[PDB]
Design a protein around this ligand. Structure first.
Ligand SMILES: NC(=O)c1ccc[n+]([C@@H]2O[C@H](COP(=O)([O-])OP(=O)(O)OC[C@H]3O[C@@H](n4cnc5c(N)ncnc54)[C@H](O)[C@@H]3O)[C@@H](O)[C@H]2O)c1
Ligand SMILES: NC(=O)c1ccc[n+]([C@@H]2O[C@H](COP(=O)([O-])OP(=O)(O)OC[C@H]3O[C@@H](n4cnc5c(N)ncnc54)[C@H](O)[C@@H]3O)[C@@H](O)[C@H]2O)c1
Ligand SMILES: NC(=O)c1ccc[n+]([C@@H]2O[C@H](COP(=O)([O-])OP(=O)(O)OC[C@H]3O[C@@H](n4cnc5c(N)ncnc54)[C@H](O)[C@@H]3O)[C@@H](O)[C@H]2O)c1
Ligand SMILES: NC(=O)c1ccc[n+]([C@@H]2O[C@H](COP(=O)([O-])OP(=O)(O)OC[C@H]3O[C@@H](n4cnc5c(N)ncnc54)[C@H](O)[C@@H]3O)[C@@H](O)[C@H]2O)c1
Lengths: 337, 337, 337, 337
């Protein structure tokens, strides 16, 4: 049993905690420590009453000022912004889950390793050559001495299994993407001062565009496509779920039905539990809480000229990404060294 | 001076009326008739107080039950759903502006021609071989005996000048698009019964995807690209403005700076007043009421492998589209036959 | 066992069907007929995939063009706007549930009685002296020969138990209310033509005010307060749940804690299952799907001058109102005559 | 001419700057200093492109890293969170406009007085006995040696003229209010950790209630009603404008038409430019940018039992409040001591 911790009890942290509360019996992981910038009275309320996933129902949530009782299970909790003053060796922490969006560097994330933690899994595309791993693509090829691992962004975590399937079946020369992304917490609500100008504007009002390198992270997790994948993101006023457009330029020519057939059988042989395949005419809010990290929308797949394919993929960047974080954490627990 | 009329005083009709009130002096067009399914007391209020373009300021709006006084200028108004019982020859109507979204067929739109109107300009991609014309691409090549002309959709009206510039400068083999579209009036507000299932769901809550053939309408207005352009649309909860992604596969290789240079000089030589070029980091709501039919977003243009280009274009599908409708109407007034 | 039917398979109809699917075993009601203006293929999809209550999970939903199989249970379905051409006696219908928002008159609703139905329960404040009944206030005092009964509006259905408790405990001279109401389907999405001007404007953008007489319906269901209760409504861009403010002028003086005590014990003795009492600092979306028809918000109750009380009550106007409709339907099944 | 400064270039600061740019010629005020936590390159962009008031049009906005050129007029700009290290005497500052929402205490706001400023006008209901003044009620009765003055909240600034008119004409025993308030910048966008739990939840999703003492601030600015006015606030997902409900218990009995007559003539004699009177059926977004600090909605005013009145007032808490701030600043410039 592996004692794990959570740095930053935000959206990813609350979803990680809720996922572990829903996957408790099959777990080699026991969550024993969290730390947020809030007191332990508030974040227990925010855990129980999520305005996106409704009221939690299965287990009882309560807290006092030093611990949080989730379903009778106790969990410790502290508050500090310095990662160096944190009781890790005092709590016996193998794996800490970096989820603050602050410690993306190696030198930032390694502060927990210095302060007495054994491995760190950071839920962000980290700066510098941090080894990145996506469940369903290359979650096998990590060396267990790599204590500082990184899951990529949610967009990369959705997009990379589709790109893996299409690269194996057809071969990819180039590829664009344009993810229509739900608004995240970084954007200011009203027009307030912010480091980047396109995130400074109002979130509920605007399609704000942004440039991301998270398309290039597929070139990290798939090495032979690096420098060939690039794309932008569009933040629109939907709170939870998002869709990603993906334009690839394959070289083995095909039609629109065949790529759907390929991804449909890949959903049932190899990418089971990663890619779901849906031939329904659903819309965005029917994917709040879906377990797969990419639902391929079947009716919109199209091919022009044989060698130019477009797919779109629904994905929940708050629930499915947390599911892949927890699956990667359990998969590194199963190969603990 | 050409006496013109408006069928359906909806969003496109109110914006058309507001544009003509802002372009009155240079106009060979006099708006003399409208008809909506509402009484003349209500739609004058809806003209004056638009919850998107604010309160109209320049001229005074009032009405009684038979006429509407806009700035002292009188305009007639009636209410009927049958187009065959309408006083057109009684009012002397050369051009009627079909904007109900109902009469898209030739046989539907020709009911006004039968009922005593001389030309009809329909603001929709019509079913059947109706001659379509976009201002800035092929607004010259209409024969003036074509009395039933069609402007295309707003997405096509934005996309086609960019595709014209890139086809002339580079040559296009294939091309995808994915427009992130503002929600239109056809979608039901709450989850209500509707003919298409993906428009049946809630508009303020959801990214609803839809399949459109309005990308193929570029293949109508540019003949040598027909059957090579296809794309989908994403309706997100923004009320007014929208952005269109466009992935083309050019064959003459280039870089990302050069296509920006080409479109920048095309903004200043030929597409002036059609395509604006913006090297600012703006967001969506800074294009409410822009006069150009496509603002090319400069910072997001990218080229992979030399022969694969992506542009994005902001466009207002309620104001700029009305501007192109009024420009096409004046341009057919200038070549009246 | 009472064979019941649903006129209009909208929000109230889908919620009624979902409630009966969740309360099947304790039911003397069997739903055997529905009719909407849509085909039976579409509304089964709209039943299964609600963008407000998520995907239905307990039972399987499928359909063909003549019947709908909900969890193996078959239900008939037809489509007609004329209520006089409907197979009621051909289907053996005791109680039809009017939920179209069209047939509010006695002469409108009695068309089903003429066409071969035995009782009609209309889910609207009907025009004319239709006997109105609220579960938890006067659901006992109906005569079973009254075949045309009316449940009131959702605002009245929330407000009247609180007014009953405060009138019994303190006595009420006068009383105002101002319900901050979620947007309903009647409002046009964009600024479109509509019979009332304040509902003609955009729903996602605006606090639209409206005048309602649903406060006066408390004076129907409580007779000694008629002509003493009046209030307005505010429609704000939230899709599901709503809150009602209520200012009463009591005459027996008291403090803010005592009215909370009175309503707390009334929640546990008489209004159990009607009024829930919450001393949490919750917000709106934590009441999506709550079973009570009024959650009294405890922290906001205030009394000025001893004789002037203000309460606020969360209530779900799409789920709890359907629950009260189904409870009234079962309660009229238990006293069938 | 009075050299003035702005602490905190947020919503109130940007609106104050935009108002002074629109009221330049009649001004004894010259804006010479601002300070925000952002660099001078960003906030000039945020001044020019407001996603609520559109693009500014009259004057040109540019900046470099030390000054901001607004229409040729230069203004200095700095960045510091400590108010004690600020160049006030180096810049010659008579009046600084506290708008950070941080320095609400006397000891906090007096740091600018210590650091070399002569008067401070704070745009918040300050803690402690800070002299508060509302334009249109008691903007005359300030002593010019009171260097630390406070404008109240926007809700109080709207509500107090109506309460002044109704107290003079009828006399008020008690009074409630319930303002349906637009969401402000303090609320977290997604469910994030926050000091108060009801502001911790999502802003675009929820009617979040909050308790405010800004109703009691009317008892400060009108002394004989203190301890008689109290109310709550409802934050709904509208970005800009808000409406306030107001229930008073008058003692001189009257009807609903007479209070409308009283406020209509008070709009034309004394409260001109403060209270506008509208007998239109407008909605919320037709008050974006209105100059009056309260638009009385005429059709909703109601009186029950003669001695119980309810009014509702539209008001823009981002533009009209800035107008009253600038009017108070000019009115203290006209009586400089
Ligand atoms: N938002 C999404 O849906 C999503 C999806 C994929 C990945 N991510 C990544 O997850 C990370 C966090 O996302 P989120 O939405 O939970 O962020 P958030 O800002 O909503 O929550 C982060 C939490 O961490 C706290 N925190 C920040 N710095 C801290 C510090 N130094 N010490 C302690 N606590 C600290 C914050 O105050 C907050 O409580 C970011 O890297 C984000 O890019 C987000
Ligand atoms: N919504 C946009 O931004 C946009 C952009 C480009 C093109 N268009 C096209 O413009 C058309 C109308 O758009 P809209 O937003 O104004 O539509 P709308 O539904 O908002 O308004 C249409 C108006 O026409 C009235 N009408 C409908 N049928 C009628 C009939 N038979 N007789 C008389 N009046 C009738 C409607 O009641 C309403 O008043 C559609 O074809 C749409 O696809 C819309
Ligand atoms: N919306 C709410 O939350 C709520 C709450 C309480 C009460 N109500 C009342 O419930 C009623 C319906 O509400 P809703 O939201 O379901 O309405 P809706 O408009 O969303 O759905 C009504 C359904 O009935 C159909 N219909 C209308 N006229 C018909 C006819 N003549 N024949 C057959 N089908 C017809 C409509 O097309 C639609 O399918 C209204 O009286 C409303 O005031 C609504
Ligand atoms: N939001 C409204 O519509 C409204 C209406 C009336 C009154 N007010 C009051 O106005 C004040 C500000 O409102 P806002 O919407 O502009 O706030 P905001 O948070 O949107 O903007 C405040 C600005 O001040 C900056 N700031 C904060 N602390 C600072 C410090 N110590 N030094 C320098 N800069 C600092 C912030 O970073 C931001 O740039 C608050 O007291 C608010 O209650 C707001």
């Amino acid at each position: 049993m592996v004692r794990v911790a959570i740095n930053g009890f935000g959206r990813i942290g609350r979803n990680f905690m809720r996922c572990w509360l829903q996957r408790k019996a099959n777990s080699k992981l026991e969550i024993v420590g969290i730390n947020d910038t809030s007191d332990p009275r508030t974040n227990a309320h925010l855990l129980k009453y999520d305005s996106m996933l409704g009221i939690f129902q299965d287990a009882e949530i309560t807290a006092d000022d030093d611990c949080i009782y989730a379903g009778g299970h106790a969990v410790k909790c502290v508050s500090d912004r310095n990662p160096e003053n944190l009781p890790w060796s005092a709590w016996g922490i193998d794996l800490v889950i970096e989820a603050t969006g602050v410690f993306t560097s190696r030198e930032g994330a390694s502060k927990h390793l210095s302060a007495g933690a054994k491995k760190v899994l950071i839920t962000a595309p980290g700066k510098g050559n941090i080894p990145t791993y996506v469940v369903g693509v290359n979650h096998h090829t990590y060396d267990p001495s790599e204590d500082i691992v990184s899951n990529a962004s949610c967009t990369t975590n959705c997009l990379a299994p589709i790109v893996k399937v299409l690269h194996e079946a057809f071969g990819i020369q180039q590829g664009m993407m344009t993810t229509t992304h739900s608004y995240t917490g970084d954007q200011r609500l009203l027009d307030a001062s912010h480091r980047d100008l396109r995130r400074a504007r109002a979130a509920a009002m605007n399609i704000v565009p942004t440039s991301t390198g998270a398309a290039k992270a597929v070139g990290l997790v798939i090495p032979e496509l690096q420098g060939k994948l690039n794309g932008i993101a569009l933040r629109v006023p939907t709170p939870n779920v998002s869709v990603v457009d993906f334009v690839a330029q394959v070289e083995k020519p095909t039609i629109a039905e065949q790529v759907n057939q390929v991804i449909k059988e890949a959903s049932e042989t190899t990418m089971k539990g990663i890619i779901h395949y849906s031939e329904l005419e659903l819309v965005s809010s029917d994917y709040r809480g879906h377990n797969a990290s990419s639902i391929l929308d079947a009716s919109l797949t199209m091919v022009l000229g044989g060698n130019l394919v477009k797919v779109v993929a629904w994905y929940d960047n708050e629930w499915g990404y947390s599911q892949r974080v927890l699956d990667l954490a359990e998969h590194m627990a199963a190969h603990w060294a």
